[PDB]
Design a protein around this ligand. Sequence first.
Ligand SMILES: CCCC[C@@H](O)C(N)=O
Ligand SMILES: CCCC[C@@H](O)C(N)=O
Lengths: 144, 155
Amino acid sequence: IEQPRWASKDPAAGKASTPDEKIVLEFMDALTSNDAAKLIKYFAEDTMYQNMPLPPAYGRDAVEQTLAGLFKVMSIDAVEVFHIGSSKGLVFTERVDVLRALPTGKSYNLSILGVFQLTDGKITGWRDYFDLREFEEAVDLPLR
Amino acid sequence: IEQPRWASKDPAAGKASTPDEKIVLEFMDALTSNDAAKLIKYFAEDTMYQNMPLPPAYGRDAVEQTLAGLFKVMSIDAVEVFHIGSSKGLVFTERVDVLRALPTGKSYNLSILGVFQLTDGKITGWRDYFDLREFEEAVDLPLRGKLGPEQKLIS
Ligand SMILES: CCCC[C@@H](O)C(N)=O
Ligand SMILES: CCCC[C@@H](O)C(N)=O
């Protein structure tokens, strides 16, 4: 993953500056496990997950199942966070996830902006925004 | 615009707490002008804009052209920011813009996560992330087929 032309040049732009930012970067590192049971440990009970072009999941079991499902069809091969910032209970990541569609073997660098809500270091919400059609077209797989 | 089920409950979650956050919320208020010439005043020289499903625009004239082109076929009728946060030189907004397509009169509450890069309070980058197809289907217009080739001319 190469730094988009528009990435902020300061190395600090992609690094954590708070406890909550640090947790979210640890979670970003964990994604390439492709392991829903590993990832669910980061979540609060009262949580949700949504890839914004697709329906949301509420509660941990649904979030874990949704992740497990995604990992049956696609792999996260690599994550690079270009930009991170925050407010109380909120962290944002502008990143690229390199995603490989297992039925076709084709990969795509997915440009994602994500938001994480936190309480006491645990994820109460995770929403990723991106264009689904562009991804489908790149890996020759209708996902919707 | 009603607040999504998942919005942070604290009232401060969508309120600015820094000078850069404040400028970006001024900019969000300005969007409903539908006026590219007003909006371009917030931009640095060394700047870019991109709606992530379509090609980027570099430099102020291209950014202004891109906004003007959008405003010829859609109106921003309302903006609500649910969540805002930041770092040095960076502001993020999770929001809804209510977009009305002029050719069909149809409106859509477009769910957007956007990032702004700043230098001494001027915008050096603005990228909005959302799903284009859902928006096209709601307002019954092939937007990419129109705006993608226009965005390619701008570049
Ligand atoms: C439908 C794309 C889902 C992508 C997700 O597992 C990711 N890379 O965050
Ligand atoms: C192609 C949709 C662009 C929407 C944009 O003018 C906005 N509301 O940020």
